[PDB]
Amino acid sequence: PKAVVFLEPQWYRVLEKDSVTLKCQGAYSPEDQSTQWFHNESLISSQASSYFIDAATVDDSGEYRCQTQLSTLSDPVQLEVHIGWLLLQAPRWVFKEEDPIHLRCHSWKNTALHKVTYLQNGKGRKYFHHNSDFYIPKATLKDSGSYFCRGLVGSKNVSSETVQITITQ
């Protein structure tokens, strides 16, 4: 009878100032449960079914667990709050052949970003005049590798940390 934490939106990697809702799912019963929340194995004040982070800061990173009256303590869910201009967000790291790959060059505060490139293994893979999501419709083995994004915000040339994407046979 384990509780489960869900993230909405689902990205476990976020930038400072992003909103993040952690949702606690307890037993699937009409029997109203109360909720409790643990962050880095410490109790926090909220007893709400949804724990809402308005404007994330680095200290909001770490492990979250929740529990309801009719539930055992959840497995941990990890939240990583990054500091910087850009974060390349993926819904997962491992894809199989012919799966769609959808990547998002998330900017700090959703600030407008121009002349955006998604690089694969240090070579330009896709360029867009304005910020736009990267889409491979059918993944192939050659799409695996190290990915980051970069672009212009105002006059600043900025870039995201690298992520590893794998395509399996």
Partner 1 sequence: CPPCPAPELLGGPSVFLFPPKPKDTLMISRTPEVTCVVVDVSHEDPEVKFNWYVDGVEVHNAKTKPREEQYNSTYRVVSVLTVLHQDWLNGKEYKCKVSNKALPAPIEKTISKAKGQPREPQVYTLPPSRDELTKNQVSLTCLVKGFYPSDIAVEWESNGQPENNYKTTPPVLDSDGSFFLYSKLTVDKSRWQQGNVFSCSVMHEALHNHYTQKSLSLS
Ligand X SMILES: *[C@@H]1O[C@H](CO)[C@@H](O[C@@H]2O[C@H](CO)[C@@H](O)[C@H](O)[C@H]2NC(C)=O)[C@H](O)[C@H]1NC(C)=O
Ligand Y SMILES: *[C@@H]1O[C@H](CO)[C@@H](O[C@@H]2O[C@H](CO)[C@@H](O[C@@H]3O[C@H](CO[C@@H]4O[C@H](CO)[C@@H](O)[C@H](O)[C@@H]4O)[C@@H](O)[C@H](O[C@@H]4O[C@H](CO)[C@@H](O)[C@H](O)[C@@H]4O)[C@@H]3O)[C@H](O)[C@H]2NC(C)=O)[C@H](O)[C@H]1NC(C)=O
Ligand Z SMILES: *[C@@H]1O[C@H](CO[C@H]2O[C@@H](C)[C@@H](O)[C@@H](O)[C@@H]2O)[C@@H](O[C@@H]2O[C@H](CO)[C@@H](O[C@@H]3O[C@H](CO[C@H]4O[C@H](CO)[C@@H](O)[C@H](O)[C@@H]4O[C@@H]4O[C@H](CO)[C@@H](O)[C@H](O)[C@H]4NC(C)=O)[C@@H](O)[C@H](O[C@H]4O[C@H](CO)[C@@H](O)[C@H](O)[C@@H]4O[C@@H]4O[C@H](CO)[C@@H](O)[C@H](O)[C@H]4NC(C)=O)[C@@H]3O)[C@H](O)[C@H]2NC(C)=O)[C@H](O)[C@H]1NC(C)=O
Interface residues with ligand Y (CB under 6 A) are: 115, 117, 150, 152, 157
Report the partner that residue 96 touches, choosing among ligand Y, partner 1, ligand X, none (CB closer than 5 to 8 A by kind): none
Report the partner that residue 80 touches, choosing among ligand X, ligand Y, ligand Z, none (CB closer than 5 to 8 A by kind): ligand X
Binding site for ligand Z (CB under 6 A): 115, 117, 127
Would you say 22 or 103 has its CB closer to ligand Z? 103
Report the amino acid identity of residue 101.
I
Q: How far is the CB of 74 from ligand X (least distance, A)?
A: 16
- Taking Cα atoms as reference points, which of 155, 165, 159 lies closest to residue 82? 159
Whole-angstrom CA distances from 38 to 11, 16, 51, 61, 68 are 19, 21, 11, 12, 12
- Residue 130 in the binding site for partner 1 (CB under 8 A): yes
Stretch that binds partner 1, among 4-12, 62-70, 97-105, 112-120 (CB under 8 A): 112-120
* Contacting positions for partner 1 (CB under 8 A): 15-16, 83-85, 108, 111-112, 114-115, 117, 123-130, 152-156, 158
